Target: SPH1118
Amino acid sequence: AFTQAPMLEQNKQLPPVDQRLPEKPLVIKPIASNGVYGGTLRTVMRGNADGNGILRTIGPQGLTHWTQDIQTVEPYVAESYTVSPDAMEYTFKLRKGMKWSDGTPFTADDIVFAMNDVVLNKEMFPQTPSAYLVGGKAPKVSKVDDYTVKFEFPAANLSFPETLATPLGQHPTLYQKKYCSQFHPAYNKNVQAEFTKANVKDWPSLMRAKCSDIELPSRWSSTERPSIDPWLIKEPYGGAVTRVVMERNPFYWQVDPTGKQLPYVDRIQYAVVSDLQAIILAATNGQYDIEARLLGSDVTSRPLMLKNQQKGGYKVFGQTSANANAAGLWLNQTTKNEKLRKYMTQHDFRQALSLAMDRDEINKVAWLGQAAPWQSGPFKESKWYNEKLATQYLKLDLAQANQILDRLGLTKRDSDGYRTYPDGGRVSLDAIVMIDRQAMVQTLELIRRQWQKAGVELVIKGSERSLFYNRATANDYDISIDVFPGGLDATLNPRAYVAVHPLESRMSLEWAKWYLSGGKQGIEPNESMKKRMALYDQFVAAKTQSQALSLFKQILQISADEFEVIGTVRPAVISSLHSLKLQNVNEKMPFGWPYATPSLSLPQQWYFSKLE
Ligand SMILES: [Ca+2]
Ligand SMILES: [Ca+2]
Ligand SMILES: [Ca+2]
Ligand SMILES: [Ca+2]
Ligand SMILES: [Ca+2]
Ligand SMILES: [Ca+2]
Model:
């Protein structure tokens, strides 16, 4: 018989555990050992809209879920699914008896509401999230019965199960129809009465504030928003809090092999900390049972973490990052600096900037020698490896860089020795970066000095998150600095190779807006990018794995020929930690947002061997 956490035995209002669970709960097979109930997991997030820290701790609860080796997905929220021979129809069978956190039924009505009334509603999302599209076209999503939902695409969509396992593909299970319909004008003609109580002026803002979206802080800022998550918000996230607390969902829909309703751990407490230096200190002091997101990407923290393992009572584990590059230069093909744009669009200008960089020095100084020079291409640990895309223009060659820049007409010099435009002033590139990402900032400081030898001025524009993203969406930057994805799975995140991501394809978000709107908005891309966008749509719609392989390789080939974005180093090891007493953490898991790590490791089966 199923059993429950002692904490839930305390609640006289709850139904018995066999009535709270689905008839067939998902049986979780723990990473290392069957666990024991109890305890509070201590972890950490930042203060300014770092809500993805909660999502990456508890896990997206999607229709499918990655396996630990990230090669495939398995049914997760769905008990099972079928794919039609032509790969156009996916039919998901849901777990009869499954309930939301409020005890009400989780059924096909919720998934159909999430898709048809939220995701595919053009007032809510003027451009539909591409996770659900093939060639810009939406699926027909229908209820078959109370526990069966069908997604019917107009072309083959082989990659849909994988998309459904990423954070961005979790909308189908994010919205309880009962609660959320109160805030939707198709359902509630008195919705305007909700505007004043929520401090909004229109219904999409009301929906975002109350029912939320994947990455909105409002996802974690209330206690009344129902979910199917393993823990539920009890002390909410907000603009100026110092901790967040979540407690177990009494209606969680999973058991372990002995029949225990999960999670094992009763509670998660997030410290909310503004400065990364304070997080380092608290982590080395042993105040966190897990930190696998904030400290690992700046390798300068690794010696400190390793040295303090005994003092803090934790074990460091190294994860392989899925990103192809730790600090990539996303050159803006649509920069509003028109004199600079005329150079940004020249292949040889981009080549020269790469040849003027000293990646061995960047590695030694900013990455402690633990990274390696790399451009933007997939790794040899992937079937998408392209030698040119990974390795072209990596070695410092200032003689050639300076000859190229001369040939491109940048021979007129200012009194400080810098090159100037043929009809303008100093060649000066504004690079936006998140100022808290100190290894990226140090990398930029090294490039700034290196590019002086080419007579090119790099201006570092470091800021907090909101200004960084607002500059990007406003097309207000010459270079944007952030990771290049695609080292391990280029097809999940192809944004460095083709401009399809509305916020992160920063070779031009205006090109991305053109792609996503079918050419109605944004800026029409050049011929090579339009070709890659058409190939991308062919790839998503491929009828067979072999066709998908050829089409996607063509995209990478063209991206290699164009050399639109410039890498510095591929990631060093990502250093994560867990308390010595915290069991069932998969220390072998890769690191990455598409897997929502560390939650890839199934936090609902983490447990404490001993408390303190
Ligand atoms: Ca009892
Ligand atoms: Ca695969
Ligand atoms: Ca059919
Ligand atoms: Ca697939
Ligand atoms: Ca050339
Ligand atoms: Ca090889």
Remarks:
- The longest helix spans residues 545-562.
- Residues 380 surround calcium ion (ligand 6) (CB under 6 Å).
